[PDB]
Protein backbone atom coordinates (compact mmCIF):
# COMPACT_ATOMS: atom_id res chain seq x y z
CA UNK A 1 0.00 0.00 0.00
CA UNK A 2 2.78 2.39 0.95
CA UNK A 3 5.84 3.39 -1.09
CA UNK A 4 8.84 5.62 -0.47
CA UNK A 5 8.42 9.37 -0.15
CA UNK A 6 9.94 10.41 -3.49
CA UNK A 7 7.67 8.07 -5.44
CA UNK A 8 4.60 9.16 -3.46
CA UNK A 9 5.49 12.82 -4.06
CA UNK A 10 5.84 12.34 -7.80
CA UNK A 11 2.62 10.28 -7.85
CA UNK A 12 0.73 13.06 -6.06
CA UNK A 13 2.09 15.56 -8.57
CA UNK A 14 0.99 13.26 -11.39
CA UNK A 15 -2.49 13.00 -9.86
CA UNK A 16 -2.69 16.79 -9.58
CA UNK A 17 -1.71 17.10 -13.25
CA UNK A 18 -4.34 14.52 -14.26
CA UNK A 19 -7.01 16.32 -12.25
CA UNK A 20 -6.16 19.72 -13.73
CA UNK A 21 -6.07 18.34 -17.29
CA UNK A 22 -9.47 16.67 -16.98
CA UNK A 23 -11.02 19.75 -15.39
CA UNK A 24 -9.61 22.22 -17.93
CA UNK A 25 -10.87 19.92 -20.69
CA UNK A 26 -14.30 19.76 -19.05
CA UNK A 27 -15.28 23.01 -17.33
CA UNK A 28 -13.32 25.61 -19.32
CA UNK A 29 -16.69 26.59 -20.80
CA UNK A 30 -17.80 27.58 -17.28
CA UNK A 31 -14.89 29.99 -16.79
CA UNK A 32 -12.65 27.43 -15.10
CA UNK A 33 -9.61 29.03 -13.46
CA UNK A 34 -7.77 26.63 -11.17
CA UNK A 35 -7.63 23.64 -8.84
CA UNK A 36 -6.03 22.87 -5.48
CA UNK A 37 -5.67 19.92 -3.10
CA UNK A 38 -5.94 19.64 0.69
CA UNK A 39 -4.90 16.47 2.53
CA UNK A 40 -6.04 15.63 6.08
CA UNK A 41 -5.32 12.40 8.01
CA UNK A 42 -6.87 9.65 5.85
CA UNK A 43 -8.85 12.20 3.81
CA UNK A 44 -8.34 14.24 0.63
CA UNK A 45 -10.39 17.19 -0.62
CA UNK A 46 -9.98 18.99 -3.94
CA UNK A 47 -11.13 22.59 -4.32
CA UNK A 48 -11.78 24.49 -7.54
CA UNK A 49 -11.87 28.15 -8.52
CA UNK A 50 -14.02 29.34 -11.43
CA UNK A 51 -15.77 32.60 -12.26
CA UNK A 52 -19.33 31.35 -12.91
CA UNK A 53 -20.15 29.34 -9.80
CA UNK A 54 -23.84 28.85 -10.62
CA UNK A 55 -22.98 27.64 -14.12
CA UNK A 56 -20.20 25.35 -12.90
CA UNK A 57 -22.58 23.83 -10.33
CA UNK A 58 -25.24 22.94 -12.90
CA UNK A 59 -28.72 21.69 -12.01
CA UNK A 60 -29.60 19.79 -8.81
CA UNK A 61 -25.87 19.90 -8.04
CA UNK A 62 -25.54 16.83 -10.25
CA UNK A 63 -22.26 17.69 -12.00
CA UNK A 64 -20.18 17.99 -8.83
CA UNK A 65 -21.28 14.58 -7.54
CA UNK A 66 -20.97 13.00 -11.01
CA UNK A 67 -17.41 14.37 -11.57
CA UNK A 68 -16.41 13.42 -7.97
CA UNK A 69 -17.54 9.83 -8.58
CA UNK A 70 -15.62 9.97 -11.87
CA UNK A 71 -12.35 10.90 -10.17
CA UNK A 72 -13.01 8.46 -7.31
CA UNK A 73 -13.56 5.70 -9.87
CA UNK A 74 -10.63 6.89 -12.02
CA UNK A 75 -7.92 6.98 -9.34
CA UNK A 76 -8.98 3.91 -7.34
CA UNK A 77 -8.89 5.67 -3.98
CA UNK A 78 -11.04 4.43 -1.07
CA UNK A 79 -14.59 5.52 -1.82
CA UNK A 80 -16.19 8.37 0.09
CA UNK A 81 -12.84 10.04 0.81
CA UNK A 82 -13.06 12.57 -2.05
CA UNK A 83 -15.18 15.73 -2.03
CA UNK A 84 -15.12 18.65 -4.46
CA UNK A 85 -16.00 22.16 -3.30
CA UNK A 86 -17.47 25.20 -5.10
CA UNK A 87 -15.38 28.37 -4.84
CA UNK A 88 -15.05 31.52 -6.94
CA UNK A 89 -11.82 33.32 -7.75
CA UNK A 90 -10.61 36.41 -5.93
CA UNK A 91 -10.77 38.23 -9.27
CA UNK A 92 -10.87 37.29 -12.94
CA UNK A 93 -8.52 40.14 -13.86
CA UNK A 94 -5.25 39.06 -12.26
CA UNK A 95 -5.70 35.40 -13.29
CA UNK A 96 -4.03 34.49 -16.57
CA UNK A 97 -5.99 31.25 -17.08
CA UNK A 98 -9.37 32.96 -16.73
CA UNK A 99 -8.54 35.75 -19.18
CA UNK A 100 -6.96 33.27 -21.60
CA UNK A 101 -10.20 31.26 -21.59
CA UNK A 102 -12.25 34.46 -21.95
CA UNK A 103 -10.22 35.36 -25.03
CA UNK A 104 -10.56 31.77 -26.27
CA UNK A 105 -14.35 31.77 -26.02
CA UNK A 106 -14.61 35.25 -27.51
CA UNK A 107 -12.57 33.90 -30.42
CA UNK A 108 -14.60 30.72 -30.96
CA UNK A 109 -17.97 32.49 -30.92
CA UNK A 110 -17.03 34.61 -33.93
CA UNK A 111 -15.41 38.01 -33.49
CA UNK A 112 -12.54 40.01 -34.96
CA UNK A 113 -9.52 38.51 -33.20
CA UNK A 114 -7.91 41.89 -32.67
CA UNK A 115 -11.13 43.33 -31.21
CA UNK A 116 -11.12 40.50 -28.67
CA UNK A 117 -7.43 41.04 -27.89
CA UNK A 118 -7.99 44.78 -27.43
CA UNK A 119 -10.95 44.09 -25.15
CA UNK A 120 -8.99 41.65 -23.01
CA UNK A 121 -6.14 44.17 -22.75
CA UNK A 122 -8.54 46.88 -21.60
CA UNK A 123 -10.15 44.48 -19.11
CA UNK A 124 -6.73 43.57 -17.71
CA UNK A 125 -5.70 47.20 -17.31
CA UNK A 126 -8.92 48.17 -15.54
CA UNK A 127 -8.34 45.18 -13.24
CA UNK A 128 -5.19 46.80 -11.85
CA UNK A 129 -2.45 44.43 -13.02
CA UNK A 130 1.04 45.90 -13.31
CA UNK A 131 1.26 44.78 -16.94
CA UNK A 132 0.60 42.08 -19.47
CA UNK A 133 1.23 40.77 -22.93
CA UNK A 134 -1.01 38.61 -25.10
CA UNK A 135 0.19 36.89 -28.28
CA UNK A 136 -2.31 35.54 -30.81
CA UNK A 137 -0.62 33.53 -33.56
CA UNK A 138 -1.97 31.72 -36.60
CA UNK A 139 -3.81 32.39 -39.85
CA UNK A 140 -5.80 35.63 -39.51
CA UNK A 141 -5.66 37.33 -42.93
CA UNK A 142 -4.49 35.09 -45.76
CA UNK A 143 -2.66 31.78 -45.85
CA UNK A 144 0.56 32.90 -44.15
CA UNK A 145 0.66 32.91 -40.35
CA UNK A 146 2.04 35.91 -38.45
CA UNK A 147 2.40 35.89 -34.67
CA UNK A 148 0.69 39.03 -33.39
CA UNK A 149 1.51 40.85 -30.15
CA UNK A 150 -0.09 43.21 -27.68
CA UNK A 151 1.71 44.61 -24.64
CA UNK A 152 0.73 47.08 -21.96
CA UNK A 153 2.21 48.12 -18.67
CA UNK A 154 5.65 46.68 -18.02
CA UNK A 155 6.69 43.02 -18.02
CA UNK A 156 9.84 41.37 -16.67
CA UNK A 157 11.17 38.26 -18.38
CA UNK A 158 14.28 37.34 -16.40
CA UNK A 159 15.55 36.40 -12.97
CA UNK A 160 13.76 34.72 -10.08
CA UNK A 161 10.79 37.16 -9.82
CA UNK A 162 9.25 35.69 -13.00
CA UNK A 163 8.60 32.60 -10.87
CA UNK A 164 5.99 34.44 -8.79
CA UNK A 165 5.52 37.90 -10.34
CA UNK A 166 4.54 36.56 -13.79
CA UNK A 167 1.70 34.15 -14.57
CA UNK A 168 1.90 32.31 -17.91
CA UNK A 169 -1.02 30.69 -19.74
CA UNK A 170 -0.99 29.02 -23.17
CA UNK A 171 -4.19 27.89 -24.92
CA UNK A 172 -5.58 26.99 -28.35
CA UNK A 173 -8.60 28.28 -30.30
CA UNK A 174 -10.01 25.73 -32.78
CA UNK A 175 -11.29 27.47 -35.97
CA UNK A 176 -12.63 26.15 -39.33
CA UNK A 177 -9.55 27.63 -41.08
CA UNK A 178 -6.96 26.58 -38.51
CA UNK A 179 -5.80 26.62 -34.90
CA UNK A 180 -4.88 29.86 -33.13
CA UNK A 181 -2.25 29.84 -30.39
CA UNK A 182 -2.83 32.22 -27.49
CA UNK A 183 -0.11 32.98 -24.95
CA UNK A 184 -0.78 35.29 -22.01
CA UNK A 185 1.77 36.73 -19.59
CA UNK A 186 0.40 38.70 -16.64
CA UNK A 187 2.44 40.60 -14.04
CA UNK A 188 0.92 40.54 -10.58
CA UNK A 189 1.30 43.78 -8.61
CA UNK A 190 3.01 44.29 -5.27
CA UNK A 191 0.09 43.11 -3.14
CA UNK A 192 0.82 42.41 0.52
CA UNK A 193 -1.98 41.68 2.99
CA UNK A 194 -4.25 39.67 0.73
CA UNK A 195 -1.89 37.59 -1.41
CA UNK A 196 -3.60 38.29 -4.73
CA UNK A 197 -0.13 39.24 -5.92
CA UNK A 198 3.25 38.57 -4.33
CA UNK A 199 3.80 39.63 -0.74
CA UNK A 200 7.42 40.56 -1.54
CA UNK A 201 8.55 43.41 -3.83
CA UNK A 202 10.78 43.30 -6.87
CA UNK A 203 14.32 42.70 -5.54
CA UNK A 204 15.61 45.72 -7.47
CA UNK A 205 13.02 48.06 -5.92
CA UNK A 206 14.25 50.20 -3.02
CA UNK A 207 11.76 52.39 -1.15
CA UNK A 208 12.78 55.15 1.26
CA UNK A 209 10.49 56.36 4.04
CA UNK A 210 9.97 60.11 3.89
CA UNK A 211 11.65 62.22 6.60
CA UNK A 212 9.35 63.37 9.39
CA UNK A 213 9.11 67.13 9.91
CA UNK A 214 9.60 68.05 13.57
CA UNK A 215 10.35 71.30 15.38
CA UNK A 216 14.10 71.58 15.84
CA UNK A 217 14.71 72.15 19.57
CA UNK A 218 16.60 75.17 20.89
CA UNK A 219 16.71 74.78 24.69
CA UNK A 220 15.81 71.96 27.10
CA UNK A 221 12.08 72.35 27.82
CA UNK A 222 10.72 69.54 30.01
CA UNK A 223 7.64 69.31 32.23
CA UNK A 224 7.36 67.53 35.56
CA UNK A 225 4.88 64.67 35.91
CA UNK B 1 -10.08 66.41 -11.52
CA UNK B 2 -7.73 68.85 -13.24
CA UNK B 3 -4.67 69.76 -11.18
CA UNK B 4 -2.88 72.58 -13.03
CA UNK B 5 0.83 72.28 -13.70
CA UNK B 6 1.52 75.78 -15.12
CA UNK B 7 0.78 79.29 -13.89
CA UNK B 8 -1.67 79.83 -16.75
CA UNK B 9 -3.43 76.59 -15.85
CA UNK B 10 -3.70 77.68 -12.22
CA UNK B 11 -5.14 81.05 -13.26
CA UNK B 12 -7.66 79.41 -15.61
CA UNK B 13 -8.76 76.83 -13.03
CA UNK B 14 -9.16 79.51 -10.34
CA UNK B 15 -11.40 81.52 -12.71
CA UNK B 16 -8.87 84.34 -13.02
CA UNK B 17 -8.89 84.24 -16.83
CA UNK B 18 -12.37 85.00 -18.12
CA UNK B 19 -11.92 83.88 -21.76
CA UNK B 20 -9.45 82.39 -24.20
CA UNK B 21 -8.95 85.84 -25.72
CA UNK B 22 -6.94 87.20 -22.79
CA UNK B 23 -4.58 84.26 -23.25
CA UNK B 24 -4.43 84.94 -27.00
CA UNK B 25 -3.81 88.66 -26.45
CA UNK B 26 -0.45 87.93 -24.81
CA UNK B 27 0.56 85.01 -27.08
CA UNK B 28 1.04 82.76 -24.06
CA UNK B 29 1.71 79.09 -24.89
CA UNK B 30 -1.16 76.86 -23.79
CA UNK B 31 0.36 73.59 -22.57
CA UNK B 32 -2.69 72.04 -20.86
CA UNK B 33 -5.68 70.90 -22.89
CA UNK B 34 -7.83 71.38 -19.79
CA UNK B 35 -7.62 75.14 -20.41
CA UNK B 36 -9.24 74.61 -23.81
CA UNK B 37 -11.78 72.26 -22.23
CA UNK B 38 -12.57 74.94 -19.64
CA UNK B 39 -13.05 77.72 -22.16
CA UNK B 40 -14.54 75.95 -25.21
CA UNK B 41 -15.22 72.39 -24.04
CA UNK B 42 -18.95 72.63 -24.62
CA UNK B 43 -18.90 73.44 -28.35
CA UNK B 44 -15.69 71.78 -29.59
CA UNK B 45 -16.21 69.09 -32.22
CA UNK B 46 -13.36 66.80 -33.25
CA UNK B 47 -12.89 65.08 -36.61
CA UNK B 48 -10.15 62.65 -37.61
CA UNK B 49 -8.95 63.94 -40.98
CA UNK B 50 -6.74 60.92 -41.58
CA UNK B 51 -5.07 57.81 -40.21
CA UNK B 52 -1.74 57.33 -42.00
CA UNK B 53 0.43 54.22 -41.48
CA UNK B 54 4.12 55.12 -41.59
CA UNK B 55 6.91 52.55 -41.48
CA UNK B 56 10.52 52.47 -40.31
CA UNK B 57 12.70 49.77 -41.83
CA UNK B 58 14.55 47.61 -39.29
CA UNK B 59 16.71 44.49 -39.31
CA UNK B 60 13.86 41.98 -38.95
CA UNK B 61 10.80 43.84 -40.21
CA UNK B 62 9.13 47.19 -40.68
CA UNK B 63 8.04 48.95 -37.50
CA UNK B 64 4.61 50.40 -38.27
CA UNK B 65 3.18 53.42 -36.49
CA UNK B 66 -0.06 55.26 -37.22
CA UNK B 67 -0.30 59.05 -37.48
CA UNK B 68 -3.68 60.59 -36.67
CA UNK B 69 -4.45 63.96 -38.25
CA UNK B 70 -7.41 65.41 -36.35
CA UNK B 71 -9.16 68.75 -36.83
CA UNK B 72 -11.04 70.35 -33.93
CA UNK B 73 -12.97 73.50 -33.24
CA UNK B 74 -16.33 74.96 -32.33
CA UNK B 75 -17.90 76.10 -35.55
CA UNK B 76 -17.45 79.74 -34.55
CA UNK B 77 -14.12 81.55 -34.55
CA UNK B 78 -11.81 78.81 -33.26
CA UNK B 79 -10.04 75.91 -34.97
CA UNK B 80 -7.10 73.63 -34.27
CA UNK B 81 -5.16 70.88 -36.02
CA UNK B 82 -3.27 68.05 -34.37
CA UNK B 83 -0.95 65.37 -35.73
CA UNK B 84 0.11 62.56 -33.39
CA UNK B 85 1.97 59.35 -34.21
CA UNK B 86 1.87 56.21 -32.07
CA UNK B 87 1.92 52.43 -32.32
CA UNK B 88 -1.83 52.29 -31.60
CA UNK B 89 -4.56 54.00 -33.62
CA UNK B 90 -6.69 54.85 -30.58
CA UNK B 91 -3.70 56.29 -28.74
CA UNK B 92 -2.78 58.24 -31.88
CA UNK B 93 -6.28 59.72 -32.11
CA UNK B 94 -6.25 60.63 -28.41
CA UNK B 95 -2.89 62.36 -28.76
CA UNK B 96 -4.00 64.12 -31.94
CA UNK B 97 -7.13 65.42 -30.22
CA UNK B 98 -4.99 66.73 -27.35
CA UNK B 99 -2.57 68.37 -29.79
CA UNK B 100 -5.38 69.94 -31.82
CA UNK B 101 -6.76 71.37 -28.59
CA UNK B 102 -3.30 72.73 -27.76
CA UNK B 103 -3.03 74.45 -31.16
CA UNK B 104 -6.44 76.14 -31.26
CA UNK B 105 -6.11 79.66 -32.68
CA UNK B 106 -8.59 82.52 -32.98
CA UNK B 107 -10.11 83.00 -36.43
CA UNK B 108 -10.76 86.52 -37.68
CA UNK B 109 -13.91 86.74 -39.78
CA UNK B 110 -14.77 89.66 -42.03
CA UNK B 111 -17.22 90.89 -44.67
CA UNK B 112 -17.06 90.49 -48.43
CA UNK B 113 -18.98 93.63 -49.36
CA UNK B 114 -21.34 95.55 -47.11
CA UNK B 115 -21.25 94.89 -43.38
CA UNK B 116 -24.82 93.95 -42.42
CA UNK B 117 -24.98 91.32 -39.69
CA UNK B 118 -22.19 89.11 -38.34
CA UNK B 119 -18.91 88.46 -40.17
CA UNK B 120 -19.18 85.52 -42.55
CA UNK B 121 -15.93 85.24 -44.53
CA UNK B 122 -12.18 85.85 -44.25
CA UNK B 123 -11.23 89.53 -43.80
CA UNK B 124 -8.88 89.40 -46.80
CA UNK B 125 -7.02 87.02 -49.08
CA UNK B 126 -4.70 84.93 -46.91
CA UNK B 127 -2.19 82.27 -47.90
CA UNK B 128 -0.85 79.34 -45.91
CA UNK B 129 2.15 77.26 -46.91
CA UNK B 130 3.31 73.78 -45.95
CA UNK B 131 5.79 71.74 -47.99
CA UNK B 132 4.99 72.95 -51.51
CA UNK B 133 1.30 73.08 -50.62
CA UNK B 134 -0.08 76.61 -50.98
CA UNK B 135 -3.65 77.28 -49.83
CA UNK B 136 -5.25 80.65 -50.60
CA UNK B 137 -8.45 81.82 -48.92
CA UNK B 138 -10.36 84.58 -50.71
CA UNK B 139 -13.37 86.44 -49.27
CA UNK B 140 -16.66 85.34 -50.82
CA UNK B 141 -20.14 86.89 -50.88
CA UNK B 142 -22.65 85.80 -48.27
CA UNK B 143 -24.40 82.51 -48.96
CA UNK B 144 -21.83 81.00 -51.32
CA UNK B 145 -20.48 78.53 -48.77
CA UNK B 146 -17.00 77.04 -48.76
CA UNK B 147 -15.72 76.55 -52.31
CA UNK B 148 -12.81 74.25 -51.51
CA UNK B 149 -11.52 70.72 -51.39
CA UNK B 150 -12.98 68.55 -48.60
CA UNK B 151 -9.81 68.68 -46.49
CA UNK B 152 -9.63 72.50 -46.28
CA UNK B 153 -13.44 72.65 -46.19
CA UNK B 154 -13.51 70.70 -42.92
CA UNK B 155 -11.12 73.13 -41.25
CA UNK B 156 -12.82 76.20 -42.71
CA UNK B 157 -16.20 75.00 -41.45
CA UNK B 158 -14.80 74.20 -38.00
CA UNK B 159 -13.27 77.69 -37.98
CA UNK B 160 -16.71 79.26 -38.34
CA UNK B 161 -16.11 80.56 -41.86
CA UNK B 162 -19.55 80.61 -43.46
CA UNK B 163 -18.37 81.19 -47.03
CA UNK B 164 -14.97 81.39 -48.70
CA UNK B 165 -13.29 80.87 -52.06
CA UNK B 166 -10.12 78.81 -52.08
CA UNK B 167 -7.21 77.98 -54.35
CA UNK B 168 -4.69 75.18 -53.89
CA UNK B 169 -1.33 74.53 -55.52
CA UNK B 170 1.24 71.79 -55.08
CA UNK B 171 0.86 68.22 -53.87
CA UNK B 172 -2.43 68.57 -52.03
CA UNK B 173 -2.79 64.78 -52.19
CA UNK B 174 -0.63 64.70 -49.05
CA UNK B 175 -3.44 65.39 -46.59
CA UNK B 176 -1.09 66.44 -43.79
CA UNK B 177 0.55 69.23 -45.77
CA UNK B 178 -2.81 70.33 -47.20
CA UNK B 179 -4.32 70.54 -43.71
CA UNK B 180 -1.32 72.34 -42.25
CA UNK B 181 -1.29 74.86 -45.10
CA UNK B 182 -4.98 75.68 -44.70
CA UNK B 183 -4.47 75.89 -40.93
CA UNK B 184 -1.64 78.37 -41.54
CA UNK B 185 -3.90 80.38 -43.84
CA UNK B 186 -6.66 80.39 -41.21
CA UNK B 187 -4.28 81.41 -38.41
CA UNK B 188 -2.84 84.23 -40.52
CA UNK B 189 -6.27 85.92 -40.50
CA UNK B 190 -5.64 87.65 -37.17
CA UNK B 191 -1.99 88.42 -37.96
CA UNK B 192 -2.97 90.56 -40.96
CA UNK B 193 -2.77 94.32 -40.43
CA UNK B 194 -5.87 95.86 -41.98
CA UNK B 195 -6.69 99.59 -41.74
CA UNK B 196 -9.28 98.92 -39.02
CA UNK B 197 -6.38 97.74 -36.81
CA UNK B 198 -4.28 100.90 -37.20
CA UNK B 199 -5.56 102.25 -33.87
CA UNK B 200 -2.76 102.31 -31.31
CA UNK B 201 -2.78 99.37 -28.92
CA UNK B 202 -3.85 100.16 -25.35
CA UNK B 203 -1.65 97.81 -23.33
CA UNK B 204 -3.32 96.02 -20.41
CA UNK B 205 -2.07 93.98 -17.44
CA UNK B 206 -0.85 90.52 -18.35
CA UNK B 207 -2.45 87.53 -16.60
CA UNK B 208 0.80 86.72 -14.81
CA UNK B 209 1.09 90.33 -13.61
CA UNK B 210 -2.57 91.11 -12.94
CA UNK B 211 -2.97 87.97 -10.76
CA UNK B 212 0.58 87.59 -9.47
CA UNK B 213 -0.67 87.91 -5.88
CA UNK B 214 -3.16 85.09 -6.44
CA UNK B 215 -0.42 82.83 -7.81
CA UNK B 216 1.84 83.63 -4.85
CA UNK B 217 -0.86 83.12 -2.22
CA UNK B 218 -2.42 79.95 -3.66
Amino acid sequence: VQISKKRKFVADGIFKAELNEFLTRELAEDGYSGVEVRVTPTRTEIIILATRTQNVLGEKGRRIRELTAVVQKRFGFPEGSVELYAEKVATRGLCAIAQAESLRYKLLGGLAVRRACYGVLRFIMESGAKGCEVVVSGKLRGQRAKSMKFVDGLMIHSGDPVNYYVDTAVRHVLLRQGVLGIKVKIMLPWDPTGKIGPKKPLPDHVSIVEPKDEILPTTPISEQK
Amino acid sequence: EWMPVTKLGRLVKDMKIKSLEEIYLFSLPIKESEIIDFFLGASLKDEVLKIMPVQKQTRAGQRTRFKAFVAIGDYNGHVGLGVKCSKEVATAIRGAIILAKLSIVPVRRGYWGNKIGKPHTVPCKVTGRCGSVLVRLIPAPRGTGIVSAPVPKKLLMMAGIDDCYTSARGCTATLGNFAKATFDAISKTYSYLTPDLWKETVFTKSPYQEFTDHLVKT
Binding site: A112, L140 | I51
Partner: peptide, 26 residues
Protein backbone atom coordinates in the same frame (compact mmCIF):
# COMPACT_ATOMS: atom_id res chain seq x y z
CA UNK C 1 -15.98 50.84 -33.56
CA UNK C 2 -12.52 49.71 -32.46
CA UNK C 3 -13.04 46.54 -34.52
CA UNK C 4 -11.83 48.39 -37.63
CA UNK C 5 -8.91 49.92 -35.71
CA UNK C 6 -7.89 46.49 -34.45
CA UNK C 7 -8.25 44.59 -37.73
CA UNK C 8 -6.29 47.37 -39.42
CA UNK C 9 -3.33 46.97 -37.05
CA UNK C 10 -3.21 43.26 -37.93
CA UNK C 11 -2.48 43.98 -41.62
CA UNK C 12 -1.65 47.67 -42.19
CA UNK C 13 -0.86 46.99 -45.87
CA UNK C 14 -3.12 43.99 -46.46
CA UNK C 15 -6.14 43.52 -48.69
CA UNK C 16 -8.40 45.12 -46.06
CA UNK C 17 -6.29 48.25 -45.63
CA UNK C 18 -7.81 51.12 -47.65
CA UNK C 19 -11.28 49.92 -46.65
CA UNK C 20 -10.53 49.98 -42.92
CA UNK C 21 -8.57 53.24 -43.00
CA UNK C 22 -11.51 54.86 -44.81
CA UNK C 23 -13.99 53.26 -42.39
CA UNK C 24 -12.15 54.88 -39.47
CA UNK C 25 -13.07 58.35 -40.73
CA UNK C 26 -12.58 58.49 -44.52
Amino acid sequence: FSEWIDDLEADPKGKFAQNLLKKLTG
